[PDB]
Design an enzyme around this catalytic site. Structure first.
Site, PDB file in Angstrom:
ATOM      1  N   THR A  10       0.855  -1.223   0.000  1.00 17.04           N
ATOM      2  CA  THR A  10       0.000   0.000   0.000  1.00 17.04           C
ATOM      3  C   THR A  10       0.871   1.248   0.000  1.00 17.04           C
ATOM      4  OG1 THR A  10      -1.672  -1.178   1.327  1.00 17.04           O
ATOM      5  CG2 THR A  10      -1.925   1.223   1.110  1.00 17.04           C
ATOM      6  N   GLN A  11       0.678   2.088  -1.011  1.00 16.51           N
ATOM      7  CA  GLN A  11       1.447   3.311  -1.172  1.00 16.51           C
ATOM      8  C   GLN A  11       0.512   4.515  -1.246  1.00 16.51           C
ATOM      9  OE1 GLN A  11       4.547   3.714  -4.099  1.00 16.51           O
ATOM     10  NE2 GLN A  11       5.196   1.561  -3.957  1.00 16.51           N
TER      11      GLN A  11
END
Ligand SMILES: [Cl-]
Ligand SMILES: [Mg+2]
Ligand SMILES: [Mg+2]
Ligand SMILES: [Mg+2]
Ligand SMILES: [Mg+2]
Lengths: 4, 195, 222, 212, 204, 196, 125, 233, 222, 196, 195
Positions: free
Chosen positions: H1-2
């Protein structure tokens, strides 16, 4: 959600 | 799974366990035996989360039976209850704990005494003259406080137990389809067929 | 938060005849309200007279087709160049799909071809691997529009013999490749009219004992 | 979905519908919800389609491996427990299955086991499983007797599915009938509700709620 | 808890050559439970027909409301309301409840008694008029109905042929929807005669 | 924080304020945000004090080990090690680092590394919360190949304004001069820079 | 881990370690099994060079694997305990999964499988 | 997750008769701050491919390094590294497409949209798109971000289908691209005036143009616009 | 929806597509998005369909009463002021996005109104889901001192960009030309570039196909 | 938005960019953010376009009604009406307004009204998203009693930098000059101001 | 509140309503009459949210009784059901809606016909041959589909009703303490005391  | 009771009297331990198995708005079964024989003189009733109950009960049964064969010797009810508690005590801090509450009724052949242990899913063990799990206790404990005597016979215990079942059938919301009653004494385990 | 899925739209359609089977699919590829491509094929010849389409999230669709194509290749290596039967392919695809039961391929898969008796076969899958052989199946965005039309025209549902007081049903019969293609083309033009994600072009893959033939038709581009 | 199976004088009746749904979308009307594990074992399917279909065909492979290794057909108890122990390992992962393992063996006789995805495993004479189980129960219980004939039992099982198929929105399509005896299972045909309903309404005089 | 898909049901309307057709299923349920197989969704005020899908309490409430309004209309105007006028009345009444709407998908159908022109119209729940030459669809199987109507429909159908087309559109759409079906009614409307037919369909 | 690094004729100068805050409380009013990773490779730290310190300590270790084997590292090499740590651990780091160094071949160089872990080589760089207020000023006033005194004035005037407007910035203005001559530390107090 | 292949083939096609394990059995006290029409009897020799023994507590030669199956042996005593333990665990495991006690053939097949596994596993004799 | 930090906006591209054109502005935005102005977002691989990248710049720089390393790896034990066994656009794309999908499948995507433009060894034009989800598609015109909404419509007026490609010259194609870049400068708030443009032709090869500017802009009409309704002054 | 407005020499022109959507489904393939507020003041609407129609009619009604009261032809700024104050009062809950245009004694005018009640002035404007496709065309081809015929061409080309490239827009192009000193000309279906092709097959059923349970004559008369 | 108002020798000048955005899309690139509430009382609008317009329209109505009864209102009076609306409806408004006006007695005056609804009289004021980048520049370059040409250059250079760094700001630079002479509108295009 | 059933037969309407009133884990009462007489030939049973049920039932009763006095005339079951529906239809869009489901069983003296109406809390009215509210329907509807005939007598209806109660007592999870049965016919309303 799905197929029942 | 809902109602499990236990009454230790003079010479025996009596376990009463509801017969109903309910899933959703359907009573799937009305003759379920919520107990396993761990050894000739030790009986365990159980109640809680679906699947977990039987899986746990049978796992304990296998372990106690394995011990019996290895040593050619029956573990005392106190020893079995301690084993069961430790398993639940491990379980509560697992990734997925066993959500199972149990009563262990046994007759100690060395002491010649009946013994009733109440163990919840957290691993909280107590020896009692009478015990219950779930909402049952909220009716039966006060009733037994009043009517229970320590020197009662097995027949007096069964009448005391009938008094509990009647009160539960009167004031409990759910229909639990009566109980299966089993007696644990010096001669082992036997079931009362007409209750 | 990162969402690993997307909807690439489009719709697919499989019909099985007596000695043939078709697998059609529009060539439009979209995201949200934008057109990505007016011609991006999603019906593929996988060899051994099996045609396949995995409609929905195109990335998962391409990954699945790619893996099945590779599964066919290794089936030849490991089993002395044996021909993969359509029923064996279907079961193989179930395991591919169910392999990712807890992080599914977001696709409605359809395969078509001939069974081991030389008769037309269409198999359809849900995203997690439940499958079933059928004469008829629409999949994708416009499936809900096309499918009831197929029930009525392919399987003659709700159609009774005239003058029989609704007692005798219209008898089932195999359709010709010509009649099937008419139903495919009318299904897709209708879906194009009433569904925004369907249009641009129609590509049909027809499977007979002779091989896999292709046909292309324009669709409205609005 | 609606599935039932009951035990009686002449063995076991098994009956299921054939509808598959994705929300309110009727996805299929022709789904096989009975799995043929072997000539003496059947399995019913309710809940997630893939979960049931995948794990019950897998169950069949485990039963085949049992009879190869042990030179003996697997018991209904053992077969159901392989399935119940499997789904129990996945407990909490989100499997959705309501199954019934039905069959006959010499040592057990006719036996039915209810097995579901939260690990419940129950032996019993009567079970109904699915979204339309209560509708099937209503008709089945009120007409059930142990001394039913093979003909009457088959009809009751069919009629119970029809009752559910009618009232439950997520059940329908067609009825699939099976009869399990000491000699094995016997298929008793696919019965489309489209024709069966009117046939039953006329001949039985029931379904007066509906505009005839 | 989606008001438009608790009770279930469908309505479809079509135009033909000097005629209109309006049809509806008979189901009324509470989600999965089928409750009634006699619940008609088509009403009429004089020669103007109104079909209503959606939340059943509102279907009933609006029918009673439009009967109320068309009765007062007739007394004051000394004539029966026309489909074009009634369509505007429906739109007005629905938008009056803009921020507390009736959860419905109404469908007007009828023939203008002066001009003789076939007229159909549809609305969303807040009254946006959807006029159409060909057909209007509404209900839980609207997608199915859109697909059926778009393929099966052709212009200038005779009353007897139009009946077959609208009936087949409704039936096959209803069979692909869990919350629709359980019987059906079709109204064939000509300039000065109206025929009402109950269809035989699968009861699951 | 208000930090900056500026290349000029003789090399490069790093500049920074001295304020560290926990919310609106000033935990440290004499912080040294200019930190040595190598003899003539320094960095300005902004963001999390714990993260930037941990990173700078690791970089210093890597460049020390580099020097033992391969001799003096380039300023680009140092920025690459910073980037590697910042980029690969971007989900667990809040670090905005400006790397500045002096080679004899490459002279003064400035690399900036924002939150994401990207690298950007620039003539000068500004960063930290107080940098927002001086983008206009620094862009209008910066010139290439300035003298030492001009660059010191440029940094002093710039950080003076950043400090004036940003509550998160303040205290003293520290500076570090990197040239062929060596390393020179400078400090400037409120009484001087406030009234510029 | 200790990996050495201790049980290996010799030029004449013999696995000497397995054959030398038989010599250990030949050294062990005699054990006999006789089955009648409705019973089986297991006889066991106990060598009499050991006086001052305590027969109450001394491990018995015949061991119960389950309530219906018994196991006697000849050879290394310490080795027998490992097989008996494994057999007893498998007996309870079979009851748990199959809901039926082991057959004598099944239990034998298991114990024999364990013995075989030690004839072609690395690091074990 | 960015979450993307320093970003690059639209990359636009199209096919013409002898090759492909691709363009992208030189901006590295930091949210609403127009932080970096010298960012090259078109990266050539060999003399026959140009990879245009939008989205997160840190992930773009990672991809640069991968492509740089891919050229090195291909040269190993390869006498024909500058001839028959040179890197093709299709090889470079498929590699990236694999990586993008693998990364999304590990729930740790490279937050980018990528357009691989080039010419194959047989003279065929190559133009294909891939993004953070591993979604791939090809078209006569391809564009990312705002380019998808504003450039594609303009570029499709020149090459609306496959048959229009041979009819489109490099002069006409480049004019449309440059016009699209101007429109994006008018309307995309995270765009800049400065941009790069690359042409990969099957005859003249790779032409890489730097430091281009949007010009011939219409702003004069603004003086006549007064108020927001009634106001006359 | 794609809607545009373009100013020219002696007036203003507005245009629109004719698709009405219901999610991904095309509800109306030829709806009218051009609305008459007064004879020479017209309105193109995007967003919530009911709200655009309802708000345009309400203001149109009040404009008519105002015109009768003041014995004057209505002005575009009056409609603009009345619309924005209504929309603002409801804080964007009335999802009406409008391009208002017209001629009046003051001259020719072109405005846009957004749901929250903000207004803009311009020579060329575009609203709706296909506004970016339309604006791309308008930015490319717009110039000062357009003629009537040039503005109609530009406007319809901007709508077409939406029709082809935006999935939310489609079907036909409506136009309204409002020139000073002349009657406004509403050009319904000015372009129809999305005509449905002939179907492959007629689905006219044989009479009696549908099974019937009951018949009855319905009484519509008194 | 980038907006500002600057008092000088002869009166006051209002300045603003012309960009309106919906997210990262530019809805209008030629917006007029300088709006007349009275003959020689104008305001710069920042924040919600719907709120600032609604407010400005109400203020204009109030000052028109004021003029009919009591003659020309002061610039302070106009700022008080803005404040009253902004302060009393602070929970439902997103409006940052700069009020600027010319009296003959009071000459040029500038009042700024931030989100809260407070009033602040200043020599010059800056506001809007793009103002953050020019606090440093404007503070260093502003002088009191500038000429008309100097103030125009000051505003032009300032907004040029704000526009350069802020993505939310851009287009043309509009200006409105308020003096005893009258009202003068000025416009400056990208090609001029970008290369300052 | 839980189980309310209704069966319209040839010459009467029969309403069966559970006697249990449960709050928490206690059955507070086992003899509760979940019905009110709206008029001599009209009876309404009810079920739903606590308090709302009785408050609503009595409010309707008062209104119908007021009408009876004013006009010296008994409203038809159809008229009463429409009045009740409208009240619920108003209620659902109130600040706090009545969460009450009702069955209205009546005998129309003008038509000489029994009539059963089922109305839920939303104001959803339907006339039925047999009706139910809550989870009861899920068992009884399918059962009645099978066994119900339109020409049944009152005695046949009561046996059909016994068949429903038995099925509910077998498969329902909760103990609802049996039912009070009331018959509505040409001679008015009367209660079956032994069920
Ligand atoms: Cl900081
Ligand atoms: Mg406890
Ligand atoms: Mg389009
Ligand atoms: Mg059904
Ligand atoms: Mg400070």
């Amino acid at each position: 959600x799905a197929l029942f | 799974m809902d109602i499990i009771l236990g009454i230790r009297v003079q010479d025996s331990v009596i376990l009463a366990s509801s017969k109903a198995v309910t899933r959703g708005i359907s009573v799937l079964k009305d003759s379920d035996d919520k107990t396993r024989q761990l050894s000739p003189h030790t009986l365990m009733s159980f109640a809680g989360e679906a699947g977990d109950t039987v899986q746990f009960a049978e796992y304990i049964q296998a372990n106690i039976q394995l011990y019996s064969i290895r040593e050619d010797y029956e573990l005392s009810p106190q020893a079995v209850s301690s084993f069961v508690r430790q398993e639940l005590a491990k379980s509560i801090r697992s990734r997925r704990p066993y959500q199972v509450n149990v009563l262990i009724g046994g007759y100690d052949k060395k002491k010649n005494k009946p013994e009733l242990y109440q163990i919840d899913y957290l691993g909280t063990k107590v020896e009692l003259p009478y015990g219950a799990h779930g909402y049952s206790g909220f009716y039966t404990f006060s009733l037994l406080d009043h009517h229970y005597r320590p020197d009662m016979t097995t027949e007096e215990g069964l009448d005391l137990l009938k008094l509990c079942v009647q009160e539960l059938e009167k004031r409990m919301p759910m229909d639990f389809k009566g109980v299966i009653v089993k007696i644990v004494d010096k001669d082992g385990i036997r079931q009362v067929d007409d209750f | 938060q990162f969402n690993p899925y997307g909807d690439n739209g489009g719709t697919i359609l499989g019909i099985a005849g007596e000695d043939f089977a078709v697998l059609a699919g529009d060539t439009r590829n979209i995201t949200d309200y934008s057109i990505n491509s007016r011609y991006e094929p999603k019906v593929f010849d996988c060899g051994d007279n099996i045609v396949m389409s995995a409609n929905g999230f195109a990335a998962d669709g391409d990954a699945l087709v790619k893996r099945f194509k590779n599964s066919v290749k290794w089936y030849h290596f490991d089993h002395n160049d044996k021909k993969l039967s359509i029923n064996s392919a279907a079961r193989n695809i179930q395991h591919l799909l169910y392999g990712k039961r807890f992080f599914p391929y977001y696709v409605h898969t359809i395969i078509a071809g001939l069974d081991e008796d030389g008769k037309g076969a269409v198999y359809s899958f849900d995203p997690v691997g439940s499958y079933e052989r059928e004469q008829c199946r629409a999949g994708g965005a416009a499936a809900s529009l096309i499918m009831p039309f197929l029930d009525n025209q392919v399987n003659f549902k709700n159609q009774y013999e005239p003058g029989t007081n609704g007692k005798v049903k219209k008898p089932l019969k195999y359709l010709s490749v010509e009649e099937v293609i008419k139903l495919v083309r009318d299904s897709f033009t209708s879906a194009t009219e009433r569904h925004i994600q369907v249009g641009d072009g129609l590509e049909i893959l027809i499977v007979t004992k002779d091989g896999v033939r292709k046909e292309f038709y324009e669709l409205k581009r609005d | 979905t609606t599935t039932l199976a009951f035990r009686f004088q002449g063995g076991i009746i098994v009956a299921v519908d054939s509808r598959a749904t994705a929300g309110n979308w009727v996805a299929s009307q022709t789904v096989k919800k009975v799995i043929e594990i072997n000539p003496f074992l059947l399995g019913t399917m309710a809940g997630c389609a893939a979960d049931c279909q995948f794990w019950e065909t897998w169950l069949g492979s485990q039963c085949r491996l049992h009879e190869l290794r042990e030179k003996e057909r697997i018991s209904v108890a053992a077969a159901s427990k392989i399935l119940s122990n499997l789904v129990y390992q996945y407990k909490g992962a989100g499997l959705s299955m309501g199954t019934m393992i039905c069959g006959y063996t010499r040592k057990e006789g006719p036996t039915i086991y209810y097995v579901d995805s939260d690990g419940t495993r129950l032996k019993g004479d009567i079970f109904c499983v699915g979204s339309g189980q209560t509708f099937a129960y209503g008709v089945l219980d009120s007409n059930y007797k142990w001394d039913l004939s093979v003909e009457d039992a088959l009809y009751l099982g069919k009629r119970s599915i029809l009752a559910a198929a009618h009232r439950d929105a997520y059940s329908g399509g067609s009825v699939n009938l099976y009869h399990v005896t000491e000699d094995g299972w016997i298929y008793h045909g696919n019965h489309d509700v489209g024709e069966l309903f009117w046939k039953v309404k006329e001949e039985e005089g029931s379904f007066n709620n509906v505009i005839g | 808890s989606d008001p438009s898909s608790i009770n279930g049901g469908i309505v479809v309307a079509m135009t033909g050559k000097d005629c209109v057709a309006i049809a509806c299923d008979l189901r009324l349920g509470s989600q999965s439970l089928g409750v009634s197989n006699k619940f008609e969704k088509i009403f009429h005020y004089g020669h103007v027909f109104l079909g209503i899908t959606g939340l059943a309490t509102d279907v009933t409430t609006l029918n009673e409301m439009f009967r109320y309004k068309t009765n007062l209309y007739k007394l004051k105007e000394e004539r029966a309301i026309e489909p074009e006028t009634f369509t505007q009345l429906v739109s007005s009444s629905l938008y009056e409840r803009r921020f507390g709407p009736y959860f419905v998908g109404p469908v007007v159908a009828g023939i203008n008694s002066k001009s003789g022109k076939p007229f159909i119209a549809g609305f969303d729940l807040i009254g946006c008029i959807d006029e159409a030459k060909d057909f209007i669809v509404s209900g839980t199987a609207s997608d199915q109905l859109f697909g059926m109507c778009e393929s099966l429909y052709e212009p200038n159908l005779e009353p007897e042929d139009l009946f077959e087309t609208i009936s087949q559109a409704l039936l096959n759409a209803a069979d692909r929807d869990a919350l629709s079906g359980w019987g059906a009614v079709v109204y064939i409307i000509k300039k000065d005669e109206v025929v009402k037919r109950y269809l035989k369909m699968r009861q699951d | 924080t208000s930090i900056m690094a500026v290349t000029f004729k003789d090399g490069v100068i790093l500049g920074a304020d001295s304020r560290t805050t926990t919310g609106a409380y000033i935990a440290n009013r004499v912080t040294d945000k200019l930190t040595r990773v190598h003899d003539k490779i320094w960095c300005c730290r902004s963001g999390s004090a714990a993260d930037t310190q941990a990173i700078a300590d690791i970089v210093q270790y890597h460049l020390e080990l580099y020097t033992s084997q391969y001799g003096t590292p380039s300023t680009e090499t140092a920025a690459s090690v910073f980037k590697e740590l910042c980029y690969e651990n971007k989900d667990n780091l809040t670090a905005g680092i400006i790397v500045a160094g002096y080679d004899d071949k490459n002279k003064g160089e400035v690399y900036t590394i924002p939150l994401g872990g990207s690298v950007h080589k620039l003539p000068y760089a500004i960063a930290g919360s107080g940098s927002t207020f001086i983008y206009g000023y620094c862009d209008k006033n910066f010139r290439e190949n300035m003298s030492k005194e001009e660059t010191v004035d440029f940094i002093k005037h710039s950080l003076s304004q950043a400090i004036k407007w940003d509550g998160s910035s303040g205290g003293v203005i520290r500076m570090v001069v990197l040239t062929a001559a060596g390393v020179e530390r400078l400090i400037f107090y409120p009484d001087e820079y406030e009234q510029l | 881990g200790y990996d050495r292949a201790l049980s290996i083939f010799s030029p004449d096609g013999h696995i000497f370690q397995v054959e030398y394990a038989l010599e250990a059995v030949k050294r062990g006290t005699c054990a006999v099994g006789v089955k009648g029409k409705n019973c089986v009897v297991l006889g066991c020799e106990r060598r009499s060079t050991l006086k001052l023994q305590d027969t109450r507590i001394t491990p018995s030669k015949v061991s119960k694997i389950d309530s219906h199956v018994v196991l006697s042996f000849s050879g290394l005593n310490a080795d027998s305990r490992i097989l008996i333990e494994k057999a007893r665990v498998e007996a309870q495991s079979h009851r748990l999964t199959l809901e039926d006690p082991v057959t004598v053939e099944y239990l034998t097949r298991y114990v024999a499988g364990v013995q075989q596994r030690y004839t072609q596993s690395g690091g074990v004799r | 997750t960015q979450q993307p930090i320093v970003t690059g906006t639209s990359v636009i591209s199209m096919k013409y008769d002898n090759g492909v054109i691709i363009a992208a502005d030189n901006l590295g935005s930091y949210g609403s701050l127009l932080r970096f102005n010298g960012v090259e977002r078109l990266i050539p691989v060999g003399d026959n491919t140009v990879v245009g990248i939008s989205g997160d710049i840190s992930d773009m720089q990672h991809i640069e390094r991968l492509l740089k390393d891919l050229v090195t790896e291909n040269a190993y034990d390869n006498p024909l590294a500058d001839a028959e066994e040179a890197l093709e656009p299709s090889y470079i794309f498929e590699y990236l497409a694999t990586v993008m999908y693998q990364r999304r499948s590990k729930m740790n995507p490279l937050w980018n949209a990528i357009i691989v433009a080039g010419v194959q060894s047989n003279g065929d034009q190559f133009l294909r798109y891939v993004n953070l989800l591993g979604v791939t598609y090809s078209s006569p015109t391809l564009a990312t971000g705002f380019g998808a909404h504003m450039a594609n419509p303009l570029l499709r007026k020149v090459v609306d289908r496959e048959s229009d490609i041979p009819k489109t010259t490099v002069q006409v194609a480049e004019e449309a691209i440059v016009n699209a870049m101007r429109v994006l400068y008018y309307r995309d708030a995270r765009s800049s005036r400065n941009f790069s443009l690359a042409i990969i032709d099957k005859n003249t090869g790779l032409t890489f143009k730097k430091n281009l500017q949007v010009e011939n802009m219409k702003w004069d009409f603004a003086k006549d616009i007064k108020g927001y309704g009634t106001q006359k002054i | 929806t794609t809607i545009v407005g373009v100013k020219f020499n002696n007036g203003v022109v507005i245009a629109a597509d004719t698709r009405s959507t219901q999610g991904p489904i095309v509800a109306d393939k030829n709806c009218a998005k051009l609305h008459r507020i007064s004879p020479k003041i017209w309105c193109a609407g995007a967003g919530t369909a009911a709200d655009t129609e309802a708000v345009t009619q309400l203001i149109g009604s009040n404009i008519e009463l105002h015109s009768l009261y003041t014995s004057r032809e209505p002005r575009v700024v009056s409609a603009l002021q009345m619309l924005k104050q209504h929309l603002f009062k409801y804080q964007g809950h009335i999802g009406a996005y409008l391009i208002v245009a017209g001629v009046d004694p003051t001259g020719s005018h072109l405005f846009s109104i957004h749901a929250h009640g903000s207004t803009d002035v311009g020579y060329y404007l575009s609203l709706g889901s296909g506004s970016l496709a339309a604006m791309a065309v308008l930015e490319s081809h717009w110039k000062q001192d357009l003629t009537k015929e040039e503005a109609i061409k530009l406007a319809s080309d901007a709508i077409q960009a939406g029709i082809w490239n935006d999935l939310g827009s489609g079907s036909n192009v409506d136009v309204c030309v409002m020139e000073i000193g002349k009657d406004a000309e509403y050009l319904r279906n000015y372009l129809t570039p999305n005509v449905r092709e002939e179907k492959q097959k007629s689905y006219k059923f044989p009479r009696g196909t549908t099974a019937v349970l009951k018949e009855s004559i319905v009484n519509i008369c008194d």
